[PDB]
Design an enzyme around this catalytic site. Structure first.
Site, PDB file in Angstrom:
ATOM      1  N   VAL A 194     -41.125   3.801  -8.681  1.00  0.00           N
ATOM      2  CA  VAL A 194     -42.575   3.809  -8.149  1.00  0.00           C
ATOM      3  C   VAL A 194     -43.797   4.267  -8.500  1.00  0.00           C
ATOM      4  CG1 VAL A 194     -42.109   3.953  -5.344  1.00  0.00           C
ATOM      5  CG2 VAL A 194     -41.714   6.027  -6.653  1.00  0.00           C
ATOM      6  N   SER A 231     -44.344   7.438 -12.209  1.00  0.00           N
ATOM      7  CA  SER A 231     -43.220   7.615 -13.363  1.00  0.00           C
ATOM      8  C   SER A 231     -44.069   9.695 -14.231  1.00  0.00           C
ATOM      9  CB  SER A 231     -43.214   6.789 -15.359  1.00  0.00           C
ATOM     10  OG  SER A 231     -42.180   7.496 -15.843  1.00  0.00           O
ATOM     11  N   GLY A 287     -40.662  14.410 -15.529  1.00  0.00           N
ATOM     12  CA  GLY A 287     -39.596  13.016 -14.834  1.00  0.00           C
ATOM     13  C   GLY A 287     -40.309  11.916 -14.254  1.00  0.00           C
ATOM     14  N   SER A 288     -39.285  10.887 -13.297  1.00  0.00           N
ATOM     15  CA  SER A 288     -39.749   9.843 -13.253  1.00  0.00           C
ATOM     16  C   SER A 288     -39.110   9.818 -11.628  1.00  0.00           C
ATOM     17  CB  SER A 288     -39.276   8.915 -13.582  1.00  0.00           C
ATOM     18  OG  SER A 288     -38.129   8.774 -13.713  1.00  0.00           O
ATOM     19  N   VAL A 289     -39.366   9.112 -10.542  1.00  0.00           N
ATOM     20  CA  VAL A 289     -39.265   8.798  -9.670  1.00  0.00           C
ATOM     21  C   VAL A 289     -39.399   7.374  -9.276  1.00  0.00           C
ATOM     22  CG1 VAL A 289     -39.648   9.013  -6.987  1.00  0.00           C
ATOM     23  CG2 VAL A 289     -40.900  10.242  -8.527  1.00  0.00           C
ATOM     24  N   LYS A 302     -35.925  11.279  -7.357  1.00  0.00           N
ATOM     25  CA  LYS A 302     -36.469  11.979  -8.537  1.00  0.00           C
ATOM     26  C   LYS A 302     -35.888  12.255  -9.533  1.00  0.00           C
ATOM     27  CE  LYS A 302     -40.486  14.784  -9.780  1.00  0.00           C
ATOM     28  NZ  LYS A 302     -41.421  16.154  -9.161  1.00  0.00           N
ATOM     29  N   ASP A 353     -45.882  17.568  -3.293  1.00  0.00           N
ATOM     30  CA  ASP A 353     -46.346  17.810  -5.002  1.00  0.00           C
ATOM     31  C   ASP A 353     -47.074  19.528  -4.668  1.00  0.00           C
ATOM     32  OD1 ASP A 353     -44.723  15.159  -6.464  1.00  0.00           O
ATOM     33  OD2 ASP A 353     -46.847  14.018  -6.610  1.00  0.00           O
TER      34      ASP A 353
HETATM   35  O1  LIG Z   1     -42.925  16.671  -3.895  1.00  0.00           O
HETATM   36  C1  LIG Z   1     -42.048  17.214  -4.538  1.00  0.00           C
HETATM   37  N1  LIG Z   1     -41.867  16.435  -5.271  1.00  0.00           N
HETATM   38  C2  LIG Z   1     -41.229  15.101  -5.095  1.00  0.00           C
HETATM   39  C3  LIG Z   1     -41.919  13.805  -5.098  1.00  0.00           C
HETATM   40  C4  LIG Z   1     -41.412  12.937  -4.775  1.00  0.00           C
HETATM   41  N2  LIG Z   1     -42.590  11.410  -4.945  1.00  0.00           N
HETATM   42  C5  LIG Z   1     -42.490  11.030  -3.719  1.00  0.00           C
HETATM   43  C6  LIG Z   1     -42.119  10.936  -2.861  1.00  0.00           C
HETATM   44  C7  LIG Z   1     -42.256  10.128  -1.696  1.00  0.00           C
HETATM   45  C8  LIG Z   1     -43.263   8.849  -1.676  1.00  0.00           C
HETATM   46  C9  LIG Z   1     -43.498   8.929  -3.319  1.00  0.00           C
HETATM   47  C10 LIG Z   1     -43.458  10.282  -4.082  1.00  0.00           C
HETATM   48  C11 LIG Z   1     -45.612   8.428  -3.347  1.00  0.00           C
HETATM   49  C12 LIG Z   1     -45.077   7.064  -2.869  1.00  0.00           C
HETATM   50  C13 LIG Z   1     -45.141   6.552  -1.430  1.00  0.00           C
HETATM   51  C14 LIG Z   1     -44.160   6.487  -0.852  1.00  0.00           C
HETATM   52  C15 LIG Z   1     -43.556   8.532  -0.622  1.00  0.00           C
HETATM   53  O2  LIG Z   1     -43.048   8.864   0.590  1.00  0.00           O
HETATM   54  C16 LIG Z   1     -40.389  12.041  -4.958  1.00  0.00           C
HETATM   55  C17 LIG Z   1     -39.144  13.508  -5.033  1.00  0.00           C
HETATM   56  C18 LIG Z   1     -40.044  14.689  -5.318  1.00  0.00           C
HETATM   57  F1  LIG Z   1     -39.101  15.712  -5.289  1.00  0.00           F
HETATM   58  C19 LIG Z   1     -42.608  18.497  -4.943  1.00  0.00           C
HETATM   59  C20 LIG Z   1     -42.707  19.160  -4.413  1.00  0.00           C
HETATM   60  C21 LIG Z   1     -43.130  20.922  -4.637  1.00  0.00           C
HETATM   61  C22 LIG Z   1     -43.159  21.323  -5.903  1.00  0.00           C
HETATM   62  C23 LIG Z   1     -43.505  19.845  -7.096  1.00  0.00           C
HETATM   63  C24 LIG Z   1     -43.116  18.738  -6.745  1.00  0.00           C
END
Ligand SMILES: O=C(Nc1cc(Nc2ccc3c(c2)CCCCC3=O)ccc1F)c1ccccc1
Ligand SMILES: CCCCCCCCO[C@@H]1O[C@H](CO)[C@@H](O)[C@H](O)[C@H]1O
Ligand SMILES: CCCCCCCCO[C@@H]1O[C@H](CO)[C@@H](O)[C@H](O)[C@H]1O
Length: 334
Positions: free
Chosen positions: A26, A28, A29-31, A46, A161
């Site tokens: 989706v 970029s 670590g990366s997701v 992630k 985040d």
């Molecule tokens: O959000 C923290 N970590 C974190 C973020 C994500 N990122 C996403 C997850 C879902 C979605 C999206 C991004 C955006 C695209 C739209 C669909 C969606 O719904 C994935 C896994 C994680 F672990 C975090 C929390 C605290 C401190 C540092 C980071």
């Protein structure tokens, strides 16, 4: 122990339990977005990039893990799973985090269109409700913006985040100005920015850089009054801010022509320069603008959060060992 499988994504090798299917990058670590065949949920996976390369990486990794484990709230991102291929602490080098994938961010809705007032109520109520919980645990988000707001089809919202397009349009002014210390109302400024944009369809403070952003803000919410001026030490900084036209607060209507008067009233309480004077998340939940949604016995507060680690300067092998114990002790939500 789950069965893992290798697959090449974002110039790295992912090694994931086989319940997680359709991994698709989706951002970029990366997701990667994925389907969790075991729960039936869409999930974000992630992979942390070199989580234990340095002290800073190792502590970053531990913090995000800790913060994710703590959050158990309908409007805040939580951990569905955390896993490692590693079978021991010494073989331990990779960390993956599994999260709800709501489906879209709050950019995918703004679409540069006015949302209805009804929809703005419902959307802002959830953000505020989530923030109340986060702020109850002494956590400040520090960078709340549509990008960090995950919504599904039914417009269920999750904040993501939050630790200790332009990416600075929603930032509290004090945050931009290296202010020694911050209160929780930094995120309330962000809320006002987001709310304003949802009602108008337009960025409230679309700064072209740092100094522009600051000038646009002083234009709408005017030059610091005497109560706030007393809280700024530097005489040269005051002189400098006053060299930017020194005009009083705009009345907060010309931007929000046609808006619910109760919405306008709320934005005026959020978008105060002096952070001591902004409405808190819990106060805003009780504001008459949310009457349709406000339930005082369903706006949960968080368990207290041990953030001592936050002041610690430790060696990598300590952050690594601390992270690993957090992995091994993880229980998923039933
Ligand atoms: O959000 C923290 N970590 C974190 C973020 C994500 N990122 C996403 C997850 C879902 C979605 C999206 C991004 C955006 C695209 C739209 C669909 C969606 O719904 C994935 C896994 C994680 F672990 C975090 C929390 C605290 C401190 C540092 C980071
Ligand atoms: C360019 C003008 C912007 C400067 C105004 C920012 C005011 C932020 O507000 C300040 O934030 C501090 C917490 O961070 C508090 O200690 C102060 O009491 C509060 O007034
Ligand atoms: C571009 C407009 C100039 C902004 C000048 C604001 C500088 C505020 O400066 C801040 O003031 C606080 C109170 O004195 C201090 O605690 C912080 O150390 C300092 O960063």
């Amino acid at each position: 122990r789950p069965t893992f499988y290798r697959q090449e994504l974002n110039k790295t090798i992912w090694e994931v339990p086989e319940r997680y299917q359709n991994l698709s990058p989706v951002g970029s670590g990366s997701v990667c977005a994925a389907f969790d065949t075991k729960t039936g949920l869409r999930v974000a996976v992630k992979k942390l990039s070199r989580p234990f390369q340095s002290i800073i990486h190792a502590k970053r990794t531990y913090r995000e893990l800790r913060l994710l484990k703590h959050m158990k709230h309908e409007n805040v991102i939580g951990l569905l799973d955390v896993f490692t291929p590693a079978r021991s602490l010494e073989e331990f080098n990779d960390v993956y985090l599994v999260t709800h994938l709501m489906g879209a961010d709050l950019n995918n809705i703004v679409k540069c269109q006015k949302l209805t007032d009804d929809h703005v109520q419902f959307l802002i109520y959830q953000i505020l409700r989530g923030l109340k919980y986060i702020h109850s645990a002494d956590i400040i988000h520090r960078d709340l913006k549509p990008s960090n707001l995950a919504v599904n089809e039914d417009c269920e919202l999750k904040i993501l985040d939050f630790g200790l397009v332009a990416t600075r349009w929603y930032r509290a002014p004090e945050i931009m100005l290296n202010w020694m210390h911050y209160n929780q109302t930094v995120d309330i400024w962000s809320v006002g920015c987001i709310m304003a944009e949802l009602l108008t369809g337009r960025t409230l403070f679309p700064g072209t850089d740092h100094i522009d952003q600051l000038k646009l803000i002083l234009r709408l919410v005017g030059t610091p009054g005497a109560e706030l001026l007393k809280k700024i030490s530097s005489e040269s900084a005051r002189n400098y801010i006053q060299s930017l036209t020194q005009m009083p607060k705009m009345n907060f209507a010309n931007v929000f022509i046609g808006a619910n008067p109760l919405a306008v009233d709320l934005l005026e309480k959020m978008l105060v320069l002096d952070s001591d004077k902004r409405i808190t998340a819990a106060q805003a939940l009780a504001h008459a603008y949310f009457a349709q949604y406000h339930d005082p016995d369903d706006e949960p507060v968080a368990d207290p959060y041990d953030q001592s680690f936050e002041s610690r300067d430790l060696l990598i092998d300590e952050w690594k060992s601390l992270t690993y114990d957090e992995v091994i002790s993880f229980v998923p939500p039933p």
